[PDB]
Amino acid sequence: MSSKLNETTEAIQRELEETTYQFKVQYNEQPMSAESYLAASLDDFKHQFH
Amino acid sequence: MSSKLNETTEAIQRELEETTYQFKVQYNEQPMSAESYLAASLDDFKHQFH
């Protein structure tokens, strides 16, 4: 395990880097949660109703 | 006290009625709570901001 550890670690760093790059280019690193989505959509609906 | 209890009770029912009448003519019996006021005003502000 200790022998495989270093190379596995470097590979994990690789896949973290690429997941981060996609998070930068496609979503512009915008934080997202379910509650934020619900609240924003509810207000859009309320403006429409007004 | 027990003697006055009956007449006082009836009078209390009556003034409950008159408080209700003022509630009818001047506020149209519109129910009001602090939370309702706050929520409505917040949405008005959000419409203004939109």
Main attributes?
mainly alpha, 2 chains, part of a larger assembly, 50 residues
List the helices and strands and how they pair.
This is part of a larger assembly, with 2 copies of chain A (50 residues).
Chain A: H1 2-27, H2 34-49
PDB class: contractile protein
Keywords: mitochondrial protein, membrane remodelling, GTPase, mitochondrial dynamics, subtomogram averaging, contractile protein
Entry title: Structure of s-Mgm1 decorating the inner surface of tubulated lipid membranes
Summarize the entry for a quick read.
The structure is cut from a larger assembly and holds two copies of chain A (50 residues). By secondary structure, the first copy, chain A, is mostly helical.
Written account of the structure:
The structure is cut from a larger assembly and holds two copies of chain A (50 residues). The longest helix of chain A has 26 residues, at 2-27. Chain A is rod-shaped, with a radius of gyration of 20 Å. Chain A is an all-alpha fold and 50 residues long. The first copy, chain A, has two helices and no strands. Chain A binds chain B through residues 43, 46-47, 50, and chain B through 43, 46-47, 50. The PDB classes it as contractile protein. Keywords: mitochondrial protein, membrane remodelling, GTPase, mitochondrial dynamics, subtomogram averaging, contractile protein. Structure of s-Mgm1 decorating the inner surface of tubulated lipid membranes.
Q: Which oligomeric form is depicted?
A: part of a larger assembly
Q: N- to C-terminal separation of chain A?
A: 63 Å
Helix and strand composition category of chain A = mainly alpha
Give the biggest sheet of chain A.
none
Q: What is the C-alpha radius of gyration of chain A, as a whole number of Å?
A: 20 Å
What best-fitting shape of chain A do the alpha-carbon axes yield? Answer: rod-shaped
Name the chain pair with the biggest interface and residue counts per chain.
A-B, 4 and 4 residues
Estimate percent helicity of chain A.
over 70%
Give me the count of strands of chain A. 0
Number of helices of chain A: 2
